[PDB]
Design an enzyme around this catalytic site. Structure first.
Site, PDB file in Angstrom:
ATOM      1  N   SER A  87      43.746  36.355  43.097  1.00 50.34           N
ATOM      2  CA  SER A  87      42.636  37.234  42.744  1.00 50.34           C
ATOM      3  C   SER A  87      41.562  36.531  41.927  1.00 50.34           C
ATOM      4  CB  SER A  87      43.149  38.465  41.991  1.00 50.34           C
ATOM      5  OG  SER A  87      43.993  38.107  40.916  1.00 50.34           O
ATOM      6  N   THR A  88      41.808  35.297  41.483  1.00 53.75           N
ATOM      7  CA  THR A  88      40.744  34.489  40.894  1.00 53.75           C
ATOM      8  C   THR A  88      39.540  34.415  41.823  1.00 53.75           C
ATOM      9  OG1 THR A  88      42.625  33.176  40.143  1.00 53.75           O
ATOM     10  CG2 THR A  88      40.431  32.411  39.518  1.00 53.75           C
TER      11      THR A  88
END
Length: 643
Positions: free
Chosen positions: A386-387
């Site tokens: 999710s970075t």
């Protein structure tokens, strides 16, 4: 039949050269005439031995000819001549002028063999001698000249079975040695009990680092030269190690020193040619009296060149130690230039034990560790997690799909477009905020926001933004790696895969170095700066990757990932240093696991000076563990020294 016989001779010469090229000296000899004056000088077995001794002494490899001429000197004797070149342990021998004659008896064309077909100007009983001087291996150094790989003096502990004992006093001294040096008592006895051991021989045991303690009966310290790695396991995957050169290595490249060391992995192998130098010496022909008559090859020994890396040795050790021996990796750069300051991979192996002869069980322990310390995790493709919301957001701001102030209404903890998604649910950790805009999604790491914005954006616009990055590109780095990929094919053909890709999962494969390359856009106003490992290399970049407005919208939000009380990286606000960050998780389900695992990510750079940037990841993280929980020390160092 004159032109046919010229052709048969050309065939014979080429078959002769081929048998020599392939190392089949027997087949080459069986193409010669009988032993006689004005025929063959030696017998068949004598020709075999002459080639095997001489060509083997110089490690002759690969014979290639050119300018082949076969004319007619006689009714039964045809003259031939050709140029030739070969490879030896002192380099290439070129422009060799060979000549000779053939014999046409019956319907067979044989070669009147002479010693001038071993080396051009050899007569009768001439000898060949080869003298060589080993080249010293170069060093690998960091951006400040600190030694990462160097050759130095090592203390080798060993025991002589004679000065030990006979029975009772022998076992006592052995246990004393095993306790005084942290050795197994069964190992000492197994060492002195191998077939090669004589009662008076020095049996080496261990390379002791540091300070030599008291030497009990039979223990003796002996200095030897060998490769040494100061950072140890903290840089093993990057630097690599060297091992003894084998006969198979020599058969592949005779210009290696059959007595030296060759890089087996890492940079030692990537820069083996530059680091090993070139053997010096002389290959000469002498008459039967030992008087030198022709020098074939002679050049001086050239030592190996040094290699200076962008690596910081203190950052490399701090980055590795912070991973606590858990599976993961950490990359640190100066994002405006791409200087790779740290390439840590955990867990790791001992490269000093590796190059100083490792036990066979100790190697197997490395190979059967489920965390697999041999992996260069900074060069292995992973889903970015999710970075990756930063990239999808920047793409959405560039193509006008994402209004930073538009608020999506998101209720609960899981979401899916409809029922066709089945068991796939986009998940978030909290239901306390139902009105989510871009700033809120980045601060709280809301995958549902990103999945919906990715879907609204669409595949075409999403890929048009992604194609501006480095997917499919081979980075110009001396590290083995595959190019990053968006997905398996050119089309998602799945709304699930599109949404999953939106927040950094799906079929995305990006290694940590490629990640830091992509994320460098946020430290260069939308310009991607390619990472750099060699210090003298020139900075390279790619412009207009994402919009300058997108960077100015997102970086203030990434500041609040740290500063907000509920930001996912709020524990870093304690540092008191200017930080823009973004955490991330990637959900992994491998076949051997009933329940799912997840990888923990942290991205962080100095938004004021753009001096440093880091991307850390924990692979298959344990409960109550995260990348940002381990980044305080490295972040403090990078902020102090790289502005």
């Amino acid at each position: 039949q004159e032109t046919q016989a010229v052709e048969a001779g050309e065939k014979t010469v080429e078959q002769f050269v081929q048998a020599l090229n392939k190392g089949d000296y027997n087949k080459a000899a069986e193409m010669t005439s009988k032993k006689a004056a004005n025929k063959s000088a030696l017998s068949e077995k004598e020709i075999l031995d002459k080639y095997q001794n001489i060509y083997g002494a110089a490690d002759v490899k690969g014979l290639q000819i050119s300018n082949l001429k076969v004319d007619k000197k006689d009714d039964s004797t045809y003259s031939f001549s050709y140029k030739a070149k070969m490879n030896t342990s002192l380099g290439e021998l070129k422009d060799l002028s060979y000549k000779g004659t053939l014999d046409r008896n019956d319907g067979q064309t044989t070669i009147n063999w002479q010693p001038n077909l071993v080396f051009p100007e050899m007569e009768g009983n001439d000898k060949v001698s080869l003298t060589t001087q080993e080249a010293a291996r170069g060093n690998i150094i960091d951006r400040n000249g600190e030694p990462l790989a160097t050759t130095g003096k090592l203390k080798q502990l060993g025991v002589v079975p004679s000065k030990l004992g006979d029975g009772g006093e022998k076992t006592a001294n052995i246990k004393a040695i095993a306790s005084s040096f942290d050795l197994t008592e069964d190992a000492i006895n197994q060492a002195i009990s191998q077939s090669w051991v004589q009662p008076d021989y020095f049996v080496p045991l261990k390379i002791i680092d540091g300070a030599t303690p008291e030497l009990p009966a039979g223990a003796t310290i002996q200095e030897v030269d060998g490769r040494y790695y100061p950072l140890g396991e903290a840089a093993a995957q990057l630097i690599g190690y060297v091992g003894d050169i084998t006969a198979e290595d020599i058969d592949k490249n005779p210009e290696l020193s059959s007595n030296g060391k060759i890089g087996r992995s890492g940079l030692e192998m990537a820069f083996d040619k530059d680091l090993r130098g070139t053997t010096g010496g002389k290959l000469s022909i002498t008459d039967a009296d030992g008087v030198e008559k022709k020098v074939l090859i002679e050049h001086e020994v050239q030592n190996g060149k040094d290699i200076k890396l962008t690596i910081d040795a203190k950052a490399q050790k701090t980055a590795f130690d912070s991973l606590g021996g858990k599976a993961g990796s950490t990359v640190a750069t100066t994002p405006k230039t791409g200087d790779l300051l740290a390439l840590a991979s955990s867990p790791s192996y001992d490269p000093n034990k590796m190059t100083n002869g490792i036990s066979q069980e100790d190697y197997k322990a490395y190979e059967e560790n489920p965390e697999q310390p041999f992996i260069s995790r900074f060069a292995t493709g992973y889903a970015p997690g999710s970075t990756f919301k930063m990239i999808t957001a920047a793409i959405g701001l560039d193509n006008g799909t994402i209004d930073p102030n538009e608020v999506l209404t998101i209720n609960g903890l899981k979401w899916q477009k409809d029922s066709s998604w089945g068991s796939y649910q986009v998940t978030r950790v909290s239901s306390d905020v139902s009105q989510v805009d871009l700033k809120t999604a980045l601060i709280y790491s809301d995958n549902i926001y990103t999945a919906q914005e990715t879907l609204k954006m669409g595949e075409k616009k999403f890929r048009t933004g992604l194609d501006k990055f480095i997917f499919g590109e081979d980075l110009d780095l001396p590290i083995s790696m595959n190019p990053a990929q968006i997905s398996n094919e050119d089309s998602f053909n799945s709304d699930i895969l599109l949404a999953d890709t939106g927040y950094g999962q799906g079929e995305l494969l990006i290694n940590p170095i490629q990640q830091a390359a992509m994320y460098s856009v946020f430290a260069n106003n939308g310009t991607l700066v390619y990472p750099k490992l060699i210090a003298d290399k020139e900075t390279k970049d790619k412009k207009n990757v994402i919009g300058e407005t997108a960077v100015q919208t997102i970086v203030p939000d990434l500041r609040e990932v740290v500063q907000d009380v509920n930001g996912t990286a709020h524990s870093l606000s304690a540092l008191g240093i200017p930080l823009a960050a973004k955490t991330g998780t990637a959900e992994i389900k491998e076949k051997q696991d009933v329940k799912g695992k997840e990888n923990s990510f942290l991205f962080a750079f100095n938004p004021d000076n753009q001096g440093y940037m880091m991307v850390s990841m924990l692979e298959n993280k344990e409960d109550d563990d995260s990348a940002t929980k381990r980044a305080s020390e490295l972040l403090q160092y990078l902020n102090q020294n790289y502005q």
